[PDB]
Design an enzyme around this catalytic site. Structure first.
Site, PDB file in Angstrom:
ATOM      1  N   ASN A  18      -3.196 -10.101  -0.738  1.00 31.74           N
ATOM      2  CA  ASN A  18      -3.458  -8.750  -1.192  1.00 31.74           C
ATOM      3  C   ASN A  18      -3.978  -8.693  -2.622  1.00 31.74           C
ATOM      4  OD1 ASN A  18      -0.410  -8.551   0.312  1.00 31.74           O
ATOM      5  ND2 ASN A  18      -2.229  -7.542   1.289  1.00 31.74           N
TER       6      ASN A  18
ATOM      7  N   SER B  81       0.848  -9.133   2.910  1.00 32.21           N
ATOM      8  CA  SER B  81       0.182  -9.821   4.008  1.00 32.21           C
ATOM      9  C   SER B  81      -0.686 -10.947   3.422  1.00 32.21           C
ATOM     10  CB  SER B  81      -0.630  -8.931   4.929  1.00 32.21           C
ATOM     11  OG  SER B  81       0.132  -8.094   5.783  1.00 32.21           O
TER      12      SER B  81
ATOM     13  N   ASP C 268      -8.672   9.659  -3.367  1.00 31.80           N
ATOM     14  CA  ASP C 268      -8.629  10.331  -4.666  1.00 31.80           C
ATOM     15  C   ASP C 268      -8.012  11.734  -4.458  1.00 31.80           C
ATOM     16  OD1 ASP C 268     -10.160   8.251  -5.841  1.00 31.80           O
ATOM     17  OD2 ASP C 268     -12.035   9.246  -5.669  1.00 31.80           O
TER      18      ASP C 268
ATOM     19  N   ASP D  78      -5.318   2.855  -6.921  1.00 34.19           N
ATOM     20  CA  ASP D  78      -4.846   3.469  -8.147  1.00 34.19           C
ATOM     21  C   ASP D  78      -3.332   3.506  -8.281  1.00 34.19           C
ATOM     22  OD1 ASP D  78      -3.657   5.871  -6.851  1.00 34.19           O
ATOM     23  OD2 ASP D  78      -5.679   6.440  -6.460  1.00 34.19           O
TER      24      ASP D  78
ATOM     25  N   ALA E 230      -3.652  -6.382   4.274  1.00 30.77           N
ATOM     26  CA  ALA E 230      -3.889  -5.086   3.615  1.00 30.77           C
ATOM     27  C   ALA E 230      -4.872  -5.217   2.463  1.00 30.77           C
ATOM     28  CB  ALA E 230      -2.560  -4.486   3.196  1.00 30.77           C
TER      29      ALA E 230
ATOM     30  N   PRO F 288     -11.232   6.922 -11.161  1.00 32.08           N
ATOM     31  CA  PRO F 288     -10.528   6.924  -9.889  1.00 32.08           C
ATOM     32  C   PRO F 288      -9.050   6.746 -10.003  1.00 32.08           C
ATOM     33  CG  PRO F 288     -11.490   4.838 -10.137  1.00 32.08           C
ATOM     34  CD  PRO F 288     -12.003   5.686 -11.314  1.00 32.08           C
TER      35      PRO F 288
ATOM     36  N   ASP G 103      -9.241   1.282  -3.601  1.00 33.30           N
ATOM     37  CA  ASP G 103      -8.960   2.709  -3.861  1.00 33.30           C
ATOM     38  C   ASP G 103      -9.847   3.551  -2.958  1.00 33.30           C
ATOM     39  OD1 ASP G 103      -8.535   5.140  -4.798  1.00 33.30           O
ATOM     40  OD2 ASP G 103      -8.768   4.629  -6.950  1.00 33.30           O
TER      41      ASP G 103
HETATM   42 CA   LIG Z   1      -8.075   7.044  -6.486  1.00 31.54          CA
END
Ligand SMILES: [Ca+2]
Ligand SMILES: [Cl-]
Lengths: 258, 560
Positions: free
Chosen positions: B244, B4, B79, B255, B72, B208, B76
């Site tokens: 993005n 996007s 998790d 991630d 978008a 993360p 992150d």
């Molecule tokens: Ca993560």
């Protein structure tokens, strides 16, 4: 009128809804959606709730399970139950509007039932506020804001440590999947601001704490699709081989991509 | 939604207007249309635009004072917690010193012409269980920072449409919990950006990118405040561009292994076009769709490397002559008159070269079968064409860091060139490229007619579920790396007395209706050709404009 809803369509058929309160406005919206996109919306509803196999058969059983395994419907219902009257009116009006057109459709199916319902062998049922919420929740949240590959990353890290030893494996992981990279082009210029939370390799404590991971990377189990965009519904084994071949060839841009 | 783009042009950069917003959300291409055109007037709303799956909230639109869009975010916000199980307590996990009972629910899949299947879904304090490795006594639970805020996000996207200024709009942006870039423009020429969503306030030491133990010490502290979301109002650059890419300096990406924010980023293609001219008109801003849609994304990244590697080669050397072809090219792909092949062969040259490079570098450094995660150049497609946007591949982004040498900030823990001078490897890849392409096309580069990518409006939705009959699939000769829909809002244009003008394209058409007897609606396909040729249709807002363009009307009287 308080009860009056006016629907005007333009030269490209785009609807404009005129109403005086929230419930009426969203009822007009749901009504025009049911007029324009009833089959698409019905299938999106089944996609977002994992009820595709009910009308399309055995090839969508794994898909339906995967959708249902990825959310907790009672939590969505509790969110809807907590809504003020004004917020609930958006969802309820929308559903109520769809329903008014759906009832007209099932009363005169000979001219109003989308052809695809006949082709696929079923008829449309009414909508509730939960169904409306689930179109959004099931698309934007549960699919498009739910991206993680941490278990795959652990699988890759286990393999890197096996090939290079523990510290070098971790260092190669950082080279391939960096936490942050200061040369990345940023939408906000550095003169404006910077993100205050500084993430780096040095402080991490959790990578050392996990078990070495040896099962197949979970990305290999996503349901493979072909060139038409249809699900292949393969054995678990042939699915994994299809995803690996598709991903080696096209990566994130390809058939097994993101 | 994987791709996007958006570019917002403010007062200081706009020509013949105070602000211009051009959005290209990339969800893939479907029949009937991924988005839904809709106008809402009453109950405090006065809006126009289009939105995916007809959500209550218009993702792309304006209200006559302000306009909004999204791309978008890819931060992150998710998790995975590695839950500790016990053989003595089936269906329990260790958390904060106690054995806590998982939530579970039984689900039955009813199957057309088959037997129903029943299974269980399990959930912990950290989210639904994705999988369980019983030999390791671990269940992996997926924790989303926006869990509990799904409905609030849908409402935030609806209420934002009533905002009349930046302060009102960011109050709704703070309620949107998914990882989404939100954009603002207004009648006075103000522009803004918010990388919206809920992000976890993690414990010190939490990496993360990898799972954390679920026993309690690694639990998130809570959520970060809205103050922390990356945002900018009236940037000194005069514009906001995104494809993005990273929101802001030092902000961490998703991630996902295949996702990176590094020196090589396709947003640079939008940025160069915006910086090029002091000011841009709405037509020039719209033309950025066409140019970026046709832009090979790798040429700019690797041309310097290729030029350096071939600089001392003779004029007759075919490795050099492939690079001279690339140097002459701006990387904009155009169809020949056959509607099948590209005018220039550069994309094919880059594909083969880059595939060879990655096989020689990143692929060779990663253990099988994970090496196959980094082998794609990103160009290989199917006869129906790409299912979404095209990006610079993850392997290419890693390779780009390596070929940047000490200009890259990423320590090369392993020399991807394995002790060989990079020039040697780049030239070997060029030798492979010449062999492959000259055997297929002959030795006269000027007559090579290489395959162009095509585009397909698929009858199956993005889930891979039929949303139309297979015969409803539509095709377009030219693949275009652009929004599924494109919309543009122009505030205070000098070409009209209206304070705002807006256009969009919802292809194949507004309506997906086909009557039982096969009669397709009058608006089933009237935006298809317009999509193909970079055309657009006006979006009306005012009662006067709707009425002037009225095709039909219906008046209902309903009580709740
Ligand atoms: Ca993560
Ligand atoms: Cl990739």
């Amino acid at each position: 009128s308080s009860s009056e809803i006016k629907i005007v369509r333009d030269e490209y058929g785009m609807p404009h809804i005129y109403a005086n309160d929230t419930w009426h406005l969203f009822y007009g919206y749901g009504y025009v959606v049911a007029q324009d996109r009833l089959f698409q919306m019905e299938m999106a509803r089944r996609s977002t709730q994992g009820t595709v196999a009910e009308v399309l058969g055995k090839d969508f059983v794994k898909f339906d399970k995967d959708i249902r395994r990825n959310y907790w419907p009672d939590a969505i219902r509790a969110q809807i139950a907590a809504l003020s009257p004004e917020d609930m009116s958006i969802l309820q009006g929308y559903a109520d509007g769809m329903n008014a057109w759906i009832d007209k459709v099932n009363t005169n199916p000979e001219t109003l039932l989308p052809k695809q319902f006949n082709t696929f062998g079923f008829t449309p049922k009414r909508w509730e506020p939960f169904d409306v919420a689930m179109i959004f929740v099931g698309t934007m949240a549960n699919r498009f804001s739910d991206s993680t590959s941490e278990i795959d990353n652990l699988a890759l890290l286990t393999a890197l440590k096996d090939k290079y030893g523990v510290s070098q494996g971790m260092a190669v992981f950082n080279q391939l999947k960096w936490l942050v990279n200061p040369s990345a082009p940023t939408t906000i210029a550095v003169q404006e601001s910077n993100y205050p939370l500084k993430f780096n390799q040095q402080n991490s404590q959790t990578a050392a704490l996990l078990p070495r991971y040896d099962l197949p990377a979970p990305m290999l189990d996503r349901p493979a699709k072909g060139a038409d965009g249809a699900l292949l519904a393969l054995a678990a084994g042939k699915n994994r081989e299809t995803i690996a071949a598709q991903f080696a060839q096209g990566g994130a841009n390809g058939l097994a991509g993101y | 939604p994987t791709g996007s783009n958006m570019w917002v042009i403010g007062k200081s950069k706009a020509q013949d207007a105070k602000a211009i917003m051009v959005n290209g959300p990339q969800f893939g291409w479907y029949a009937p249309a991924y988005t839904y055109g809709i106008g809402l007037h009453g109950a405090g709303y006065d809006v126009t635009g289009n939105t995916p799956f007809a959500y209550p909230g218009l993702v792309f639109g304006h209200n006559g004072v302000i306009s909004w869009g999204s791309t978008a975010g890819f931060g992150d916000d998710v998790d995975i917690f590695a839950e500790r199980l016990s053989a003595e307590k089936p269906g329990y996990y260790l958390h904060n010193g106690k054995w806590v009972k998982m939530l579970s629910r039984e689900e039955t899949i009813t199957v057309k012409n088959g037997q129903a299947e029943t299974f269980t879904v399990w959930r912990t304090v950290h989210g639904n269980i994705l999988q369980t490795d019983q030999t390791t006594q671990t269940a992996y639970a997926k924790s989303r920072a926006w869990d509990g805020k799904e409905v609030a996000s849908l409402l935030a996207w609806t209420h934002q449409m009533k905002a009349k200024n930046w302060q009102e709009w960011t109050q709704q942006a703070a309620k949107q919990a998914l990882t989404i870039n939100w954009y603002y423009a207004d009648v006075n020429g103000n522009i803004g950006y918010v990388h919206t969503g809920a992000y976890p306030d993690r414990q010190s030491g939490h990496d993360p990118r990898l799972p954390v133990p679920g026993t309690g010490k690694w639990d998130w502290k809570g959520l970060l405040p809205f103050e922390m979301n990356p945002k900018v109002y009236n940037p000194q650059s005069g514009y906001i561009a995104n494809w993005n890419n990273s929101p802001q300096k030092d902000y961490p990406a998703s991630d996902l292994f295949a996702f990176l924010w590094g020196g090589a980023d396709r947003v640079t293609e939008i940025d160069r076009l915006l910086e090029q001219k002091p000011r841009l008109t709405a037509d020039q801003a719209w033309d950025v769709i066409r140019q970026t849609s046709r832009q090979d994304l790798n040429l700019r990244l690797f041309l310097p490397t290729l030029q350096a590697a071939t600089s001392g080669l003779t004029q007759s050397d075919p490795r050099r002559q492939l690079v001279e072809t690339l140097t002459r090219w701006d990387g904009i792909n155009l169809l020949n008159d056959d509607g099948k092949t590209w005018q220039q062969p550069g994309s094919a040259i880059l594909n083969v070269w880059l595939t060879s490079m990655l096989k020689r570098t990143v692929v060779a450094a990663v253990p099988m079968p994970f090496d196959k995660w980094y082998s794609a150049s990103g160009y290989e497609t199917t006869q129906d064409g790409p299912t979404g946007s095209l990006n610079i591949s993850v392997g290419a982004k890693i390779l780009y860091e390596a070929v940047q040498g000490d200009k890259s900030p990423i320590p090369q823990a392993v020399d991807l060139f394995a002790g060989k001078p990079q020039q040697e490897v780049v030239l070997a890849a060029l030798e492979d490229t010449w062999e492959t392409l000259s055997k297929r096309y002959g030795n006269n580069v000027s007559n090579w007619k290489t395959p162009a990518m095509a585009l397909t409006f698929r009858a199956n939705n993005f889930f891979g579920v039929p949303q139309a009959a297979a015969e409803e699939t539509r095709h377009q000769a030219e693949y275009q790396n652009r929004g599924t829909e494109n919309d543009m809002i122009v505030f205070s244009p000098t070409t009209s007395d209206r304070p705002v003008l807006a256009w969009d394209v919802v292809a194949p058409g507004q309506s997906g209706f086909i009557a039982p007897d096969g009669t397709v609606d009058k608006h089933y396909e009237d935006q298809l050709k317009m999509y193909e040729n970079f055309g657009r249709k006006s979006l009306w807002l005012t009662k006067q404009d709707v009425e002037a363009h009225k095709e039909s009307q219906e008046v209902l009287h309903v009580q709740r």
